Recover the amino acids of this structure.
């Protein structure tokens, strides 16, 4: 019910941190992949480590317990994977483990039941096979390295948790390549660059002019249960609009969207790919013990011998005339936001800021 709110709350909290690290760069990430990866990790955690992770994910433990959160993610995973051929949406989970490392049955069975995860015998003693075998399997997703706390000599990798997402879809109203023109994109009020600009003419789509936050929201739907929300702040009002990115503002926009006969729409063709280390960012959002000697991941092995060495996230989005792919004149010729979102939920599959499409 209000567990998607936690996921959205988390999405925008994380986005703001990503933005502080690179003020004027393109942003692209799957917040759901991170939430599901962290929830998946929390299956093996206890006490303060478990508490920091759930609270960090923006769940309120006053109204929803641990089991209900894991059931929520289990139910969500079934609703994405299955099934419609017209739009290819899927999210999986996996864990690469050291061979002799023995796990608790509880953990592996819950990992299988709740998250569909399965162990793969892996040798981490060479970084060639280890880091390559994983990157094939994961193109868009997030990975959590677990390390031995604990051993005297070295801090060796014991386990890697993984959550991937895949998204390939076509527009309900696709752009005609014949109408794609090179055109101005303003990086700042004075400074611009030539970009491939797609356009649609005389179409009717959900629209909402938000006068208070000085931004225009438009919804371009895909065939299937998903849609791209594009938000266009007025010049110099991007930072103000980012400040207002909250669960309440996203719900409002979507409820406020009403069909309007647009004369001309211009959206740039763009392809953003970003790689993030999330250690510092997760630390700021109140997940600290898991990266410490004080970490309690005894739910994995049975002893407090495991700690999170690192959490990374890689995402790639292509927006083009035919559709989107994870590898009144409304004109998007200045920095904008794209939020990809399912039809019947508040969750966020992907989110991005496009500052310069000739970049990333």
């Amino acid at each position: 019910l209000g567990l998607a709110s936690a996921n959205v709350d988390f999405a925008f909290s994380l986005y703001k941190q990503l933005v502080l690290k690179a003020p004027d760069k393109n942003v692209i990430f799957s917040p759901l992949s991170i939430s599901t990866a962290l929830a998946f990790l929390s299956l093996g955690a206890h006490n303060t480590t478990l508490t920091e992770i759930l609270k960090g994910l923006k769940f309120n433990l006053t109204e929803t317990s641990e089991a209900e959160i894991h059931q929520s993610f289990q139910h969500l995973l079934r609703t994405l994977n299955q099934s419609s051929d017209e739009l290819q949406l899927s999210m999986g989970n996996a864990m690469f483990v050291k061979e002799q490392l023995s796990l608790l049955d509880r953990f592996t069975e819950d990992a299988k039941r709740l998250y569909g995860s399965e162990a793969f015998a892996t040798d981490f003693q060479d970084s060639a096979a280890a880091k390559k075998l994983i990157n094939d399997y994961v193109k868009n997703g997030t990975r959590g390295k677990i390390t031995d706390l604990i051993k005297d000599l070295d801090s060796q990798t014991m386990m890697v948790l993984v959550n991937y997402i895949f998204f390939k879809a076509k527009w309900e109203m696709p752009f005609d390549p014949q109408d794609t023109h090179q055109s101005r994109f303003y990086l700042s009020k004075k400074k611009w660059v030539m970009v491939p600009m797609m356009s649609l003419h005389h179409l009717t789509i959900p629209y909402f002019r938000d006068e208070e936050l000085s931004c225009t929201v438009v919804e371009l739907k895909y065939t299937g249960n998903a849609s791209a929300l594009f938000i266009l702040p007025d010049q110099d009002k991007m930072e103000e609009v980012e400040a207002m990115l909250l669960p309440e503002t996203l719900k409002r926009w979507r409820d406020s969207l009403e069909f309007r006969e647009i004369g001309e729409l211009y959206l740039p063709k763009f392809s953003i790919s970003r790689d993030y280390n999330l250690n510092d960012i997760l630390l700021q959002l109140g997940i600290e013990e898991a990266f410490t000697s004080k970490a309690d991941l005894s739910g994995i092995t049975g002893a407090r011998n495991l700690a999170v060495s690192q959490v990374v996230h890689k995402a790639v989005l292509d927006v083009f005339e035919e559709g989107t792919e994870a590898s009144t004149i409304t004109r998007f010729n200045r920095p904008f936001l794209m939020i990809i979102v399912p039809t019947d939920t508040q969750n966020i599959f992907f989110m991005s800021k496009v500052t310069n499409p000739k970049q990333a």
